[PDB]
Amino acid sequence: MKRIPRKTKGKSSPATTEPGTSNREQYKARPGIASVQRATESAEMPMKNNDEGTPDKKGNTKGDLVNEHSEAKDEADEATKKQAKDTDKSKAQVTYSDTGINNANELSRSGNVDNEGGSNQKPMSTRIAEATSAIVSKHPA
Amino acid sequence: TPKCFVMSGVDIESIPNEFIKLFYQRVKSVHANILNDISPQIVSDMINRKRLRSHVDVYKVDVVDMLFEVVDVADGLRNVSR
Amino acid sequence: TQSLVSSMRGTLDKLKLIKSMTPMYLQQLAPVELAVIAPMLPFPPFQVP
User: Fold this and answer.
1) Using a CB-CB distance cutoff of 8 angstroms, which residues of chain A are in contact with residue B49?
2) Chains with 3 or more CB pairs closer than 8 angstroms to B?
3) How far apart are CA B78 and CA C41, in angstroms?
4) Which chain A positions have a beta carbon within 8 Å of B45's beta carbon?
5) B53 close to B21: Cβ distance less than 8 angstroms
6) Cβ atoms A140, A94 nearer than 8 A
7) Where in the cell is it found (chain B) (predicted)?
């Protein structure tokens, strides 16, 4: 009967001394439990959510207006910077950008392109409002 | 990168700063076909797409170029001359 | 201007006969480790031949 709280919002929102139980062993484990546990905590994190380019609650796409190649390059630069920060160095030994590969046809999801293949220089909801307002008729005087 | 833009609406002749005039002249004369030109109205729309739905110098002024046409209305009709 | 055959050869011999235990590690223990972690990863392996 004990309720389980939700974590996300929703629609509504004799002697008894055994002879061999004394603790006297002193063992130091190698590798260390704390270090292995920290590494496993880091490793078990799930992957992030890449929702850019998908429609929203109303129907508009989500993201920012950047060309696909530029978005890919910016993401590579951000990944390289994050790697450098993690390794605690000014520059990173391993880089996701400026490699020797001519990967100039790469494309990434962006908020500039809708699901129909058109541009999002004007929101879909506003476009629909335009189209439906174009055919309104009024009460005679 | 193809996310760069150059703002139009000011004639390249009328640029006050001379070094910037030279830079813009050379760029437009060499790479004319691969430049993205946008109007100030387009810039304003980009800025306000979704949201919309001390000492000050006294010797700086804003100037505009005015367009007009000479019209002869000698008769009830109109005649555009120039 | 000066011959370097003796010096160059001597250096290469030291590199060739170094007491590096890395090659036996990659051959024996490294595959064993990768087999252990692999079933526990949040993102299971995805390989091409």
Assistant:
1) 121-123
2) A
3) 82
4) 121
5) no
6) no
7) Host cytoplasm, Host cytoskeleton; Virion
Alpha helices in A52-109 (DSSP H): 68-87
Q: What span, in angstroms and rounded, lies between the C-alpha atoms of C30 and C28?
A: 6
State whether the Cα torsion C5-C6-C11-C13 is positive or negative: positive
Residue B72 bridge partners (DSSP): B79
- For A126, the token pair is 């506003």
CA dist., res. C3 & res. C18, Å (int): 25
Token pair listed for A41: 């905590």
Residue type, B13: E
Query: Between β-strands B71-72 and B37-38, what pairing exists: parallel, antiparallel or unpaired?
Result: unpaired
| A140 in contact with C, Cβ within 8 Å | no
**Chain A residues whose beta carbon lies within 8 Å of the beta carbon of residue B52:** none
Distance CA A34, CA A86 (A): 20
- Dist CA C49 CA C36 (whole Å): 21
Residue A69 has which token pair?
A: 């190649």
Q: Using CB atoms and an 8 Å cut-off, which of residues 17-76 of chain A contact chain B?
A: 65-67, 69-70, 73
* Residue A136 DSSP symbol: -
Taking residue A79's Cβ as centre, other Cβ atoms within 10 Å add up to 15
Rounded-to-integer distance, Cα A53 and Cα A47, Å: 18
Determination approach? cryo-EM
Resolution in angstroms, to 1 decimal, for this deposition? 3.0
The closest alpha carbon to A112, from A60, A58, A56, A63, belongs to A63
